[PDB]
Design a protein around this ligand. Structure first.
Ligand SMILES: [Cl-]
Ligand SMILES: [Cl-]
Ligand SMILES: [Cl-]
Length: 163
């Protein structure tokens, strides 16, 4: 584990991360997709062999020796707010189990269900709080990746408030 486990946020493409493993914001069918998923497909295409997994789960596939944890958040256009909330929390719990199983000291993670699966709603606080609930008990250094300047400031504020 990391000596003093921390949370950090960076505004840049997760495909350029400096961590020991990456979490993909995957679709259930293991398709190249859009946004984060498409960037992950371009950088680690080998990790999409048999990566299909249900909503609310995570499935890790190696690209060489680099782990890609495919985490499937719900698409809020299809689920109710209640059911989608439950599946989003479940996907993050499965990411924490995989990060622990892998023995990594750091992990790069995007905010699940905040892009095209958001159902047109701002889900920064919802998704980030489920990330914290799952990852708080792990000892890996967590680096959250985002692309929006206002989201970077809000995620950074939420991290600092708890310290
Ligand atoms: Cl970039
Ligand atoms: Cl998304
Ligand atoms: Cl963003």
């Amino acid at each position: 584990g990391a000596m003093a486990p921390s949370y950090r946020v960076k505004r840049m493409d997760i495909a350029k991360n400096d961590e020991e493993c990456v979490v993909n914001a995957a679709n259930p069918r293991g398709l190249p997709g859009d946004g984060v998923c498409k960037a992950v497909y371009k950088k680690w295409p080998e990790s999409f062999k048999n990566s299909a997994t249900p909503v609310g789960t995570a499935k890790t596939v190696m690209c060489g020796t680099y782990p890609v944890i495919h985490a499937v958040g719900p698409n809020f256009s299809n689920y109710t707010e209640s059911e989608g909330d439950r599946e989003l929390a479940a996907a993050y719990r499965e990411v924490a189990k995989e990060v622990t199983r892998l023995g990594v000291n750091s992990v790069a993670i995007p905010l699940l269900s905040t892009g095209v699966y958001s159902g047109g709603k701002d889900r920064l606080t919802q998704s980030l709080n489920h990330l914290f609930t799952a990852m708080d008990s792990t000892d890996a250094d967590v680096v959250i990746y985002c692309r929006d300047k206002e989201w970077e400031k809000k995620i950074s504020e939420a991290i600092q408030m708890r310290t």
